[PDB]
Prior knowledge:
This is part of a larger assembly, with chains A, B and C. By secondary structure, chain A is mostly beta strands. Chain A is 11% helix and 31% strand. Chain A is globular. Chain C is an alpha+beta fold. In chain C, strands 1-2-3-4-9-10 form a 6-stranded mixed beta sheet. In chain C, strands 5-6-7-8 form a 4-stranded mixed beta sheet, with no helix packed on it. The longest helix of chain C has 16 residues, at 135-150. Classes of the chains: A mainly beta, B mainly alpha, C alpha+beta. Chain B binds chain C through residues 29, 32-33, 36-37, 39-42, 44-45, and chain C through 58, 78, 80-83, 135, 138, 141-142, 145-146, 149, 211, 214, 221. The structure holds 3 RNA strands. Chain A: This is Large ribosomal subunit protein uL3. Chain A: Keywords: Cytoplasm, Isopeptide bond, Methylation, Phosphoprotein, Ribonucleoprotein, Ribosomal protein, Ubl conjugation.
Amino acid sequence: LPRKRAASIRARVKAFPKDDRSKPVALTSFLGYKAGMTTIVRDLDRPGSKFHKREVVEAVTVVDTPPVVVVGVVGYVETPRGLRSLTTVWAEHLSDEVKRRFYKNWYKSKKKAFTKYSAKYAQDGAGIERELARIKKYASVVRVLVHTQIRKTPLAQKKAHLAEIQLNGGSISEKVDWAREHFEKTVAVDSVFEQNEMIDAIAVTKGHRGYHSRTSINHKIYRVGKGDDEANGATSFDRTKKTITPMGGFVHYGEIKNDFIMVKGCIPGNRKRIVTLRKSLYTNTSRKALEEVSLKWIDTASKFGKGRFQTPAEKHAFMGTLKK
Amino acid sequence: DVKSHLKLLEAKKNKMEAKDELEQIKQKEKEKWQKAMLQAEGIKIRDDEKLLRKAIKRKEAQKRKSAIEWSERKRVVEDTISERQKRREENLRIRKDN
Amino acid sequence: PKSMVIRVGQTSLANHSLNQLVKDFRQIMQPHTAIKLKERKSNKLKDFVVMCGPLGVTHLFMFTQSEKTGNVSLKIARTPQGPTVTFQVLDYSLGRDIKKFLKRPKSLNNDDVLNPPLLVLNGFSTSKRSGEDDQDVNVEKVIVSMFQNIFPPLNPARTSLNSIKRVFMINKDRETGEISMRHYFIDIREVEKAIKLTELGPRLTLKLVKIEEGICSGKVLHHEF
RNA sequence: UGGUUCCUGCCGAA
RNA sequence: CGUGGAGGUCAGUGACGAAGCCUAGACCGUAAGGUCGGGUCGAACGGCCUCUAGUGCAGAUCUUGGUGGUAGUAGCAAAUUGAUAGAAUAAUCUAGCGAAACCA
RNA sequence: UGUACAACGGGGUAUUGUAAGCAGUAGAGUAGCCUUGUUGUUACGAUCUGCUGAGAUUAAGCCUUUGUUGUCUGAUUUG
């Protein structure tokens, strides 16, 4: 392949997994921001391997997961020339993150982005509800418009990212009504992704050669960590009350007070990068897919140097008191 | 021109060698203070024995390069004119054979 | 009329205190001499600035401390061939210490004071003889030319008097043998005048040492000890 | 060896 | 058919414009060509019957002159009190000057 | 003109390995002083001990900031 640079730093999802209309209406991908890498102790459950029922130490990558919010939908009708959106539907109240995304000079603009669109709910909704019933009627496939809570993130960019997600639940009408309830509300990955899920990662890699869109597939999610948990770094074996945040935090990133996904292996791109987490394009059954992993211990030490503790309470407990 | 700077350099050195040694020391003091003032002021003072000669040597070497190149280009022009005359002679000899 | 600031030597680049002086001199000078994004200087390069610098800069500044004695030195240079002037420091002051000694609302931070500073010579020279040594008078006149020619030349009726913000003064008493460079940010009292001053950055005092060639240690032109 | 200066009509080979 | 000159003739034309030039102006000739309009122009020139010839060109790598591209190119003594300047430290750019080879 | 930005400051994390300076009976010994010692003690004494994981660095591409301080603007283009 000719190595030309990426178009956008938010990499495109060129293909989505297959629509099952017998499952409830649910998302198919997510956009998070990778914090960094650490090392996880767990037990291997692999008969046929000599390392069966044996402690393995594994490199993982953790992506910060702010809860994503839906602000619009887009229905595509089939043409003999390809997919084409007949329209897009927006919600009324959109944040300055998203109105910032449309603008290049937000700091001096009069911020006039979706003003007259807000007059479209000043009415009963007749044009808007006509459009919703149109996307019920036409537009065989449905994509939803989502953006992240980037202010809840140590990113210096206050401008959140918008993306489309193909909605592979059932019933296009129930899909657009589902999105209609889910306008301006939130969706966490706990209703979308789960433990042991084989996911694919779509991300622009590290420029220096580089800065190319890459899709690395078949990565087992190891932890769907909740933001309210203070035992994010804990296990049933590791009974410390500690977070997933490293000692000193993630290097050049900040922290994760939000939800997070800890996934096996490595991933294209660097830290501070927008990464799409897509579920698998097929039902992998490789027994590397079916594995219900069970963690044991989480490294949360410093990568800012050769770390030697996990909690600072452990640090004071070993070092005792100081002169300071 | 560097020729003129070398002329002024030799004129300054002859004026210094003409005068008395105490006047020489005092004029060297005057020239070092005024020269430091003009240099730190911003006037690039360019008067050296070796450097002005080496600038002349570089200019002479460049002109020698130019002479070699132009002489060679004239030789190649004469070569091409001779070869085209040879071509036309051969065409005339073929047409004399026909 | 651009300018440089570098600390020369292992002892200089070893000192974190002298880095503060480097930062503050970078904050004092004009936008044309704003060397900024040259904070990270290298261990490898040692008098390597003279090869790439005079493509686009003049008037280099050197910091050096002797390995034997606990004294650190300023040198003032030209990137074309000229003189250098060697100075010992006196009473090095941290600008953050001037913060904590006296709190003043400073405009070093904002980009509104992205403007060149001005020239005040507090009796640095005497055109009169005043003594038996006229070479000292020549020293005074040459260094006057230095400070008026490091900064951009100001034929004053051409100059726009809107930008005043940075001002700079060199205090020379003849009996002390001491030159002191203290600069202030200006404030305007609009009375048709009256002008306030506030301290901004490093306050110093120097001592004349020697005059060499603009290439450092090239030709020692004047001794003063 | 190469070149060898206006038109039209008529006759016109090897 | 056209050109220079010569004899005769048209008591030919001509400063109220000859000759020459131009003419996205008209006309007559099969053509060689000729006639007129208009514009420019300033001093000579034509038709007819004859005579006479240094009398008709696209070429001859023809002669001479003029002008192209090459090309702002090569390149900077290529021709031009002493020498292309300016900047890069007194070790690439701008500025200035500026070819030839060759060319159904 | 704002959880706004920035210079400081603070806290966190990591690096190096006990800073300067104070005290000593610790110090192989040499003189010195008598109260010639059953550690009698006073001077020099590389070093050692306590103050002391002390002191120094810490983002220049680490993290955070209810603390301080200042800031917010011109040139061009389009129906």
